RNA sequence: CUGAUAACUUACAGGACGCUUUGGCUUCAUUGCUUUUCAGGUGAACUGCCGAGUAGGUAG
């Protein structure tokens, strides 16, 4: 069982994946897009439970579009910040636990890191579910792309990062997970009534595969100290 | 009526239908009824034969009992095409003697436009000919 | 409820005429007018932004106390033509 | 359940004036393409009449 979500054209995303890197959005944001799609189907079919996912990126285009904030209370605008935005077009393949077209469309989450995520109506035909990996990757259109595996080789430093960047220019650092500063406790106000901790961004290098499967499929691992969206092989 | 052939050769089967139309016209001495083929295509005469102005003759009744039968434009015989064969060129010179025969010469280049001969024979003699029929 | 619309326009301009896309907002440390853009096929192309488009659908507010022209819907609904605030909290 | 939730960057504009690239020039000697080769379906759509007829008509 494999489910195919093709052509998720996102208009205005954050290129700020970290307080450090500007480029493709943090892989935790791609995980939030998948897990909110997992959580919307559980209203109707409550046993769905996505295990992993695979990302096929076309067409980044990172730009310095601005962001006009609204007026705040003595009424003026707040302080201004340079804004980096990007326009990701990608096909998402998810490994389902085990569905109508009307259920798959209305359960799509409508944001991917602050950006309007949409599928065209003429691409609603290509939301079919497949049982093998070969038939799913032959099914999707927009053939040129990358498949986004993690680069696992000894980057303990920015000089270790930039040494990998100058060898292959398209190597695309981003935010991969979160690193806790303190163990989660009970706070008087936390977003939706859970334990709150204070974390920091983890930067990893992101490869690309011509296309074996465990290098591609990303999933969220939970450790006591930190949380990272890893591929299944690593 | 139109007789449509459904079993083959449309050449040597439409020529048999005209021989029955031939022998009918000397029993009764009538020349009114004519013949035409709606499907007169280039490849073949066709599978359709119609008479305008025969089905009570012994040929059409016995052929009806088997599985195969059903029971503006002008179709005329061109006997100038019978003269274009080299046996007919020698028939033409024998009349003109009855005189240098070496003064004659062949055409060496002739073009013929869609002659559609149906093969038949004579019963008065034992002799064969063709039905070179055009539009 | 979902309700997708796909809108497509067809503008017949004069010969060789101007188009006016949206333009960027950046901090200052020579180019005085920089357009917002995407990549369509293999080329750059002017766009008219997603927040700019949503502000045009939401120009509804003609119920402020001296209403002539409809304003963009928001808190203490501001006018950016004349730098004022209709629906100021003193009202 | 996404460094979450919300987000209009706008207005105006004349790059212009002037301009000699030129002089000179040897591509040239030699040369064997050869040997051998079945296009066949022609039993047949004939024999008379008319006409001054290599024209043109018709009989079985």
Q: Beta-carbon neighbour count of residue A33 at 10 Å?
A: 24
Answer yes or no: do A64 and C26 touch at CB < 8 A. Answer: yes
Q: What's the token pair of residue A210?
A: 């011509």
Give the domains, in start order, of chain B with CATH numbers.
2-134 (3.30.70.2540)
**Residues A36, A50 contacting (CB under 8 angstroms):** no
Task: Specify the resolution in Å.
Answer: 2.9
Q: Beta-carbon neighbour count of residue A172 at 10 Å?
A: 19
DSSP per-residue codes, A70-126: PPB---B--------EE--EEEEEEE-----HHHHHHTS-SBSSSSBEE--GGGGGG
CA pair distance A68, B123, nearest whole angstrom: 109
| Distances, alpha carbon A184 to alpha carbons A31, A176, A190, A197, in Å | 21, 20, 11, 4
| Phi/psi at C57 (5° precision) | -70, -30
Of C37, C51, C76, the CB nearest to A63: C37
Nearest to A8 by CA among A133, A92, A105: A92
CA pair distance B2, B49, nearest whole angstrom: 6
| Distances, alpha carbon C59 to alpha carbons A12, C77, C78, in Å | 21, 10, 11
DSSP β-bridge partners for residue A16: A22
Nearest to A184 by CA among A144, A220, A224: A224
CA pair distance B21, B24, nearest whole angstrom: 5
CA pair distance B85, A194, nearest whole angstrom: 109
Interface check for C48 against chain A (CB to CB < 8 A): the answer is no
Kindly identify which residue of chain A lies nearest to residue C39, measuring between CA atoms: A61
DSSP per-residue codes, C14-80: -TT------B-----------B-EEEETTEEEE---HHHHHHHHTEEE--STT-SSPEEP-TT-EET
CA pair distance C79, C18, nearest whole angstrom: 26
Nearest to C58 by CA among C71, C67, C68: C71
Give the technique used to solve this structure. Answer: cryo-EM
Residue A166 DSSP SS3: helix
The span from the first CA to the last CA of chain C, in angstroms, equals 36
Interface check for C51 against chain A (CB to CB < 8 A): the answer is yes
Residue B96 DSSP SS3: helix
**Residues A232, A214 contacting (CB under 8 angstroms):** yes
Answer yes or no: do C76 and A75 touch at CB < 8 A. Answer: yes
Q: What's the token pair of residue B124?
A: 């008065």
Q: What's the token pair of residue A140?
A: 């999707």
Q: What's the token pair of residue C70?
A: 């409809």
**Residues A178, A200 contacting (CB under 8 angstroms):** yes
Nearest to A199 by CA among A223, A219, A218, A215: A223
Answer yes or no: do A68 and C27 touch at CB < 8 A. Answer: no
Q: What's the token pair of residue B20?
A: 């029955």
**Residues A94, A3 contacting (CB under 8 angstroms):** yes
**Residues A33, A136 contacting (CB under 8 angstroms):** no
Angle subtended at Cα A172 by Cα C29 and Cα A17, rounded to the nearest 5 degrees: 60
CA pair distance A191, A169, nearest whole angstrom: 39
Q: Beta-carbon neighbour count of residue A163 at 10 Å?
A: 12
Q: Which nucleotides of D are covered by protein (CB under 7 A)?
A: 1-13, 44-51, 53-60
Measured N-to-C along each axis, helices B58-65 and B11-27 cross at an angle, to the nearest 10 degrees, of 140
Contacts 24+ apart (CB under 8 A), C23-27: C24/A63, C24/A64, C24/A65, C24/A66, C25/A65, C25/A66, C25/A67, C25/A68, C25/A80, C25/A83, C26/A64, C26/A66, C26/A82, C27/A80, C27/A81, C27/A82
């Amino acid at each position: 069982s494999f489910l195919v979500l093709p052509n998720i054209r996102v208009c205005g995303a954050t290129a700020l994946s970290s307080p450090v890197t500007v480029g493709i959005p943090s892989l935790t944001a791609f995980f939030g897009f998948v897990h909110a799609f997992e959580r919307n189907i559980n209203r109707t079919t409550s046993s769905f439970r996505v295990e992993s996912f695979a990302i096929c990126v076309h067409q980044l285009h990172v730009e310095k579009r601005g962001l006009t904030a609204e007026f705040v209370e003595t009424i003026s605008a707040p302080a201004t910040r340079d804004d980096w935005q990007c326009d990701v077009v990608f096909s998402l393949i998810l490994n389902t636990n085990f569905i109508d077209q009307d259920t798959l469309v209305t359960s799509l989450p409508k944001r991917l890191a602050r950006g309007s995520a949409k599928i065209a109506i003429d691409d609603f035909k290509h939301i079919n579910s497949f049982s093998t990996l070969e038939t799913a990757i032959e099914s999707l259109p927009i053939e040129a792309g990358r498949w986004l595996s993690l680069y696992a080789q000894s980057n303990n430093n920015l000089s270790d990062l930039l040494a990998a960047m100058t060898e292959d220019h398209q190597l695309m650092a981003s935010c991969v997970g979160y690193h806790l500063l303190e163990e989660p406790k009970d706070k008087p106000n936390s977003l939706r009534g859970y334990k709150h901790a204070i974390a920091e961004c983890i930067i990893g290098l992101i490869n690309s595969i011509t296309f074996d499967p465990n290098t591609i499929f990303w999933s969220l691992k939970n450790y006591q100290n930190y949380l990272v969206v890893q591929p299944r092989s690593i | 009526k139109t007789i449509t052939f459904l079993p083959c050769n449309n050449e040597s089967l439409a020529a048999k239908c005209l021989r029955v139309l031939h022998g009918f016209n000397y029993q009764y001495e009538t020349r009114n009824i004519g013949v035409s083929f709606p499907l007169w295509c280039d490849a073949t005469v066709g599978k359709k034969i119609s008479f305008v102005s025969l089905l009570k003759q012994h040929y059409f009744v016995q052929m009806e009992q088997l599985q195969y039968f059903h029971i503006y434009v002008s179709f005329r015989r061109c006997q100038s095409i019978d003269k274009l064969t080299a046996a007919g060129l020698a028939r033409k010179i024998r009349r003109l003697e009855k005189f240098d025969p070496s003064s004659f010469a062949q055409k060496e280049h002739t073009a013929i436009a869609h002659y559609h001969s149906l093969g038949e024979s004579s019963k008065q003699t034992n002799r064969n000919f063709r039905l070179n029929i055009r539009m | 409820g979902l309700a997708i619309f796909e809108v497509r326009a067809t503008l017949h301009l004069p010969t060789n005429a101007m188009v006016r896309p949206s333009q960027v907002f950046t901090e200052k440390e020579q180019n005085s007018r920089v357009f917002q853009s995407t990549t369509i096929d293999g080329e750059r192309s002017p766009i008219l932004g997603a927040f700019k488009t949503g502000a045009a659908i939401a120009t509804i507010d003609d119920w402020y106390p001296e209403a002539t022209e409809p304003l963009r819907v928001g808190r203490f609904g501001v006018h950016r033509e004349d730098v004022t605030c209709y629906r100021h909290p003193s009202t």
